[PDB]
Design a protein around this ligand. Structure first.
Ligand SMILES: Cc1ccc2c(Nc3ccc(Cl)cc3)nccc2c1Nc1ncccc1-c1ncnc2nc[nH]c12
Length: 256
């Protein structure tokens, strides 16, 4: 069972915080990460967000999904997961401008798809796939998670970005996001960098007037990869491949 015995978790340095939790590097049978509700005596809504994350996490045992280790309630609500050295894909691509070789870029995309495939098989829609939620453990293994606490607009499918009433999230919207991550990998940059207006991007992606510029993908990038990416970014929801297909396609070209 996953309730950690009372008073075992030690909190160390603070990493990040926000309305929906505070994160520390901690100690529990070695290095762990700890997500704590800091101000205690919680809302029935905070208690629900806790129960919801624990419900999803306790379903996941996979190398490409951050390792949930257990939870606690005393003295306060907490989620314990493995500690990872390294940094997010976003940080590597867009802040320190790491230049991976092509065979490694494909490896990163494969692992992300392994992970996505797994979540979908357990009926989990990520809802927020972006390169910042793809961690590079020792810059080697990929760990998917939700590392945050409308900074995900760039990865939003037109159905999502359009702010429709009826829930717009599906397996296919996650795929769209994956397609943008692929663009990020293959072009080394973020889409729509020549537009400085957020409302304008929202409006244009949403109406289908604006789409990522696929001619920016490097020449050493396999033609079957560029194809897969375009297939992933299709404006029609159901034309987009599902994750078993994507994985199969990536593992196919991964041979050449
Ligand atoms: C303590 C904690 C709790 C839950 C997390 C989480 N939840 C989650 C929810 C849904 C699904 Cl499908 C998968 C995962 N996703 C990512 C990170 C989570 C996390 N850890 C972090 N949270 C914020 C910022 C940094 C880290 C973090 N975690 C480990 N190693 C790290 N190394 C640097 N930062 C690290």
């Amino acid at each position: 069972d996953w309730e950690i015995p009372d008073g075992q978790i030690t909190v160390g340095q603070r990493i990040g915080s926000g309305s929906f939790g505070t994160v520390y590097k901690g100690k529990w049978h070695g290095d762990v990460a700890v997500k704590m509700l800091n101000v205690t005596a919680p809302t029935p809504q905070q208690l629900q967000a806790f129960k919801n994350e624990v419900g999803v996490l306790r379903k996941t045992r996979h190398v490409n999904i951050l390792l949930f280790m257990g939870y606690s309630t005393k003295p306060q609500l907490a989620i314990v997961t493995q500690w990872c050295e390294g940094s997010s894909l976003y940080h590597h691509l867009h802040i320190i401008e790491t230049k991976f070789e092509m065979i490694k870029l494909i490896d990163i995309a494969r692992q992300t798809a392994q992970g996505m495939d797994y979540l979908h098989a357990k009926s989990i829609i990520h809802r927020d796939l972006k390169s910042n939620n793809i961690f590079l453990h020792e810059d080697l293994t990929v760990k998917i998670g939700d590392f945050g606490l409308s900074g995900s607009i760039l990865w939003m499918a037109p159905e999502v970005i359009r702010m429709q009433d009826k829930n717009p999230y599906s397996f296919q919207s996650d795929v769209y996001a994956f397609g943008i991550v692929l663009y990020e990998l293959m072009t080394g940059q973020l889409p729509y960098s020549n537009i400085n207006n957020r409302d304008q991007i929202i409006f244009m992606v949403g109406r289908g007037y604006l789409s990522p510029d696929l001619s920016k993908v490097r020449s050493n990038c396999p033609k079957a990869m560029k194809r897969l990416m375009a297939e992933c970014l299709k404006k029609k929801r159901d034309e987009r491949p599902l994750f078993p297909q994507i994985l199969a396609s990536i593992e196919l070209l991964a041979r050449s």
